[PDB]
């Protein structure tokens, strides 16, 4: 009743009073203001110069309720723009929040965890500053228990989420030592039964694997690929999405790292992923496939054994344009490193028609890719004297009829590739 | 030619969370 709908000035009045209880009430009012459905007056609160006051209340062990209120208020301010988050950091909140992680009051240390999450999530710089202030040990200590299941559901979700932000951002990526520190715990969270924890854990792994092969390696080295393939089959889209991104990232690495997801049985899930109702999953899955077709011939052979070429043909034939483009890539990569027998199989699966149909697309990049593929296939037929038979097939379904049309195309690389095909393989 | 990095949005999780 007395902390509902206060005006910023009343809040300032109470916070500036010489009464701790008056400050507590004013702070709770500030918090409720910052927690209203929409458009919380974050800037008004900031201009009033309240951040420094809140930060100081964080250090009042004697009055844990004001620690909590100011923590919640600061958390919400920190959830705004970079400028608003900067305001919190500039108030000296980082060290103060790290100290609260040790609080005896779970709901208070949890608020500190959340705030640290908002601060780190802003970007690389604040992320690394939080780490430099020593946040990782306290955070990890909060999860150092025999069974994660004994922790409050929300409490676990907040730590997991905050840890995933410490793994987030790329320019630069989190410090290597910090990653190593966090990884073990992350590996444990990846085996927890709560879906939100799994989703955020997968997001964390997806961030760590979004980079150079050395980065992917320290993750693969932890033995999480199998757990990821498992989560890849999850029924909850919020889990499958980040899991698929992690698996997709890992196969952008070395052939050896890519072999790890294959050995884990990832390919068996793709007939489903490649036909997934969610356009995005379908796109990420086809992209993931494209990098797998850019691997060794024995890996392209796995794609073949799992019967995934027909699914690629299917996705090249009908799907969101972005997914089709990813399909084009998977094909051009496949033809590029595949054996003759494998390229013949691709043709036998019906790759030609859908491939030709895309040549009518308004996108110079995809056309280049498709032309490349056409070239790669002809080169395989060249090795069998079947070049002619191929020309017919491409001829049979308006293929040549489209390559000539592009022979006049504007793009440098295009008309060239176009031309060569018309002469070197036709008339 | 080969591996093409994961590039472009997603869009991933929100960077921050306001507590209602």
From Swiss-Prot, chain A:
Residues 72-168 are annotated as: NLS binding site (major). The keyword Membrane does not apply. GO terms for biological process: entry of viral genome into host nucleus through nuclear pore complex via importin; positive regulation of viral life cycle; postsynapse to nucleus signaling pathway; protein import into nucleus. The keyword Repeat applies. Slightly detected in brain but not in cerebellum and skeletal muscle, highly expressed in testis and spleen. Ubiquitinated. Deubiquitinated by USP22; leading to stabilization and increased activity. One of its GO terms (molecular function) is nuclear import signal receptor activity. Signal peptide: none annotated. Disulfide bonds: none annotated. Coiled coil: none annotated. It comes from the Eukaryota. Keywords: Acetylation, Cytoplasm, Nucleus, Phosphoprotein, Protein transport, Repeat, Transport, Ubl conjugation. GO terms for cellular component: cytoplasmic stress granule; cytosol; glutamatergic synapse; host cell; NLS-dependent protein nuclear import complex; nucleoplasm; postsynaptic density. ARM repeats lie at residues 1-41, 42-81, 82-123, 130-174, 176-212, 213-252, 255-294, 297-339, 340-386, 387-426. It is found in: Cytoplasm; Nucleus. Residues 245-333 are annotated as: NLS binding site (minor). Belongs to the importin alpha family. Consists of an N-terminal hydrophilic region, a hydrophobic central region composed of 10 repeats, and a short hydrophilic C-terminus. The N-terminal hydrophilic region contains the importin beta binding domain (IBB domain), which is sufficient for binding importin beta and essential for nuclear protein import. Heterodimer; with KPNB1. Component of a complex containing CSE1L, RAN and KPNA2. Interacts directly with CSE1L. Interacts with PLAG1. Interacts with APEX1 (via N-terminus). Interacts with FRG1 (via N-terminus). Interacts with ARL4A, CTNNBL1 and NBN. Interacts with ANP32E. Interacts with SNAI1 (via zinc fingers). Interacts with SNAI2 (via zinc fingers). Interacts with BAG6. Interacts with AIFM2; this interaction likely mediates the translocation of AIFM2 into the nucleus upon oxidative stress. Interacts with RSL1D1. Functions in nuclear protein import as an adapter protein for nuclear receptor KPNB1. Binds specifically and directly to substrates containing either a simple or bipartite NLS motif. Docking of the importin/substrate complex to the nuclear pore complex (NPC) is mediated by KPNB1 through binding to nucleoporin FxFG repeats and the complex is subsequently translocated through the pore by an energy requiring, Ran-dependent mechanism. This is Importin subunit alpha-1. It comes from Mus musculus (Mouse). The gene is Kpna2.
Curated annotation (Swiss-Prot), chain B:
The modification N6-acetyllysine is found at residues 16-17. Dephosphorylated at the late M phase. SV40 large T antigen, HPV E7 and adenovirus E1A bind to the underphosphorylated, active form of pRb. N-terminus is methylated by METTL11A/NTM1. Monomethylation at Lys-3 by SMYD2 promotes interaction with L3MBTL1. Changing residue 3 to R: Abolishes monomethylation by SMYD2 and subsequent interaction with L3MBTL1. Expressed in the retina. Expressed in foreskin keratinocytes (at protein level). A motif (Bipartite nuclear localization signal) lies at residues 3-19. It is found in: Nucleus; Cytoplasm. The modification N6-methyllysine is found at residue 3. Transmembrane segments: none annotated. It is linked to Childhood cancer retinoblastoma: Congenital malignant tumor that arises from the nuclear layers of the retina. It occurs in about 1:20'000 live births and represents about 2% of childhood malignancies. It is bilateral in about 30% of cases. Although most RB appear sporadically, about 20% are transmitted as an autosomal dominant trait with incomplete penetrance. The diagnosis is usually made before the age of 2 years when strabismus or a gray to yellow reflex from pupil ('cat eye') is investigated. Bladder cancer: A malignancy originating in tissues of the urinary bladder. It often presents with multiple tumors appearing at different times and at different sites in the bladder. Most bladder cancers are transitional cell carcinomas that begin in cells that normally make up the inner lining of the bladder. Other types of bladder cancer include squamous cell carcinoma (cancer that begins in thin, flat cells) and adenocarcinoma (cancer that begins in cells that make and release mucus and other fluids). Bladder cancer is a complex disorder with both genetic and environmental influences. The Pocket domain binds to the threonine-phosphorylated domain C, thereby preventing interaction with heterodimeric E2F/DP transcription factor complexes. Belongs to the retinoblastoma protein (RB) family. Tumor suppressor that is a key regulator of the G1/S transition of the cell cycle. The hypophosphorylated form binds transcription regulators of the E2F family, preventing transcription of E2F-responsive genes. Both physically blocks E2Fs transactivating domain and recruits chromatin-modifying enzymes that actively repress transcription. Cyclin and CDK-dependent phosphorylation of RB1 induces its dissociation from E2Fs, thereby activating transcription of E2F responsive genes and triggering entry into S phase. This is Retinoblastoma-associated protein. It comes from Homo sapiens.
């Amino acid at each position: 009743q007395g902390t509902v709908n206060w005006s910023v000035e009343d809040i300032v009045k109470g916070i500036n009073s010489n009464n701790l209880e008056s400050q507590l009430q004013a702070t709770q009012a500030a918090r409720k203001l910052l927690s209203r459905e929409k458009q919380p007056p974050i800037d008004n609160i900031i201009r009033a110069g309240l951040i420094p006051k809140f930060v100081s209340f964080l250090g009042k062990t004697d009055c844990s309720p004001i620690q909590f209120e100011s923590a919640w208020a600061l958390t919400n301010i920190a959830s705004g723009t970079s400028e608003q988050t900067k305001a919190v950091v500039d108030g000296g909140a980082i060290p103060a929040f790290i100290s609260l992680l040790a609080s005896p009051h779970a709901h208070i240390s949890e608020q500190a965890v959340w705030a640290l999450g908002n601060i780190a999530g802003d970007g690389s710089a604040f992320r690394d500053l939080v780490i430099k202030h020593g946040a990782i040990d306290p955070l990890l200590a909060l999860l150092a228990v025999p069974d994660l299941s004994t922790l409050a559901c929300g409490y676990l979700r907040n730590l997991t989420w905050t840890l995933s932000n410490l793994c987030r951002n790329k320019n630069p990526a989190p410090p290597l030592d910090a990653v190593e520190q966090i990884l073990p715990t992350l590996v444990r969270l990846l085996h927890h039964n709560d879906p939100e924890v799994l989703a955020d854990s997968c997001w964390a792994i997806s961030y760590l694997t979004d980079g150079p092969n050395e980065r992917i390696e320290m993750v693969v080295k932890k033995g999480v690929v199998p757990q990821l393939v498992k989560l890849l089959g999850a029924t909850e889209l919020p889990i499958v999405t980040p899991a698929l991104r992690a698996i997709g990232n890992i196969v952008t690495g070395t052939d050896e790292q890519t072999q790890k997801v294959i050995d884990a049985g990832a390919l068996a899930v793709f007939p489903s992923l490649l036909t997934n109702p969610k356009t995005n999953i379908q796109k990420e899955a086809t992209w993931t496939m494209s990098n797998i077709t850019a691997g060794r011939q024995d890996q392209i052979q796995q794609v073949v054994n799992h019967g995934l070429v027909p699914f690629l043909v299917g996705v090249l034939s009908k799907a969101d344009f972005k997914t089709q483009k990813e399909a084009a890539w998977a094909i051009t990569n496949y033809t590029s490193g595949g054996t003759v027998e494998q390229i013949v199989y691709l043709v036998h699966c019906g790759i030609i028609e859908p491939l030709m149909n895309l040549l009518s697309a308004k996108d110079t990049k995809i056309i280049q890719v498709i032309l490349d593929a056409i070239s790669n296939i002809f080169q395989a037929a060249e090795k069998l004297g079947e070049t002619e038979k191929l020309s017919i097939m491409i001829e049979e379904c308006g293929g040549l009829d489209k390559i000539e049309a592009l022979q006049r195309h504007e793009n440098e690389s295009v008309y060239k590739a176009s031309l060569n095909l018309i002469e070197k393989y036709f008339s | 030619c080969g591996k093409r990095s994961a590039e472009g949005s997603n869009p991933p999780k929100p960077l921050k969370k306001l507590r209602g």
